[PDB]
Amino acid sequence: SEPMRPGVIRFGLTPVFLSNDLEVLDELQAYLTQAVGQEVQLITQRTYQEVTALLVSGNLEAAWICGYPFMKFRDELDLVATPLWRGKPVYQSYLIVGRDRDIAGFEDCQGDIHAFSDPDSNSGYLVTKTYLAERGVSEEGFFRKSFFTYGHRNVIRAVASGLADSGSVDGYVWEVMKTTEPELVAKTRVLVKSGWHGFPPVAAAAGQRKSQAVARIRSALLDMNQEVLGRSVLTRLQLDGFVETTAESYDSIAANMERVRRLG
């Protein structure tokens, strides 16, 4: 009950997938500082589990996490805002293979070495795990080996370089990189696209509905197109902005989590 507050407002995220990442991070840190009206520090961690645990335990004010970890810690978290990409707050998981790989569909990946992105990513893990669960298999049964690359861009590199025969990646990442690193991406192709799911949201700890810091962060995200600097960050990410959503937008993820739970 003695309150504990941080020395600065902290916004957590996982590493940005772009090549000029320090530039995007600097502009985003500047934007949020400018919009919130006091210093904001960006805290990057490698994995979704680390970002999420920091947020749940009160060591961040907000964080950009995946819908999967959000749904896992749903009672301890509140949604702040969801990104818009190509006009909509949704995205797909892609199952990718080498550009010239001679195969017809998903079942031909049996026996592959498979690159997943993060065990707490919807698009880098859970969707593919759902395909497998529905057919009575798990990654250890279906693939000869699988591994986590801890980044979507890294899945693409692992498949492009031939260390993995197939991989599971965020379809937003793959499409954005198709334009920013076209020579890299041209070494892969999309074998399977999933259904649409809610785009990875920004969330806050549930004890913080009343927090002035959370409210200002929320307005900063929602108003990000109103400022030159905010537009600049959005342009580099190819996002359109942020919108308000509710947990219902993440129901297709929760439904897949339940399908996977019911695998033996």
Residue numbers in the entry: 41 to 304
Question: Mind quoting what the paper says about this structure?
Answer:
While the majority of both structures overlay very well, there is a significant difference in the rotamer conformation of Tyr88. The change in the side chain conformation is further associated with the backbone shift for residues 83–88 and a significant conformational change in the loop region comprising residues 53–61, demarked by the black circle in Fig. 5A. It should be noted that while surface residues 59–61 in the arsenite-bound structure are near the neighbouring molecule in the asymmetric unit, they are too distant to be directly involved in the interactions, while in the apo-AioX Asp61 interacts with the side chain of Arg281 from the crystallographic symmetry related molecule. These small differences in molecular packing support the idea that 53–61 loop conformation change might result in the generation of a new protein interaction surface. The fact that the arsenite-bound and apo-AioX crystals displayed differences in molecular packing (forming weak local and crystallographic symmetry related dimers, respectively) supports the idea that loop conformation change might result in the generation of a new protein interaction surface.
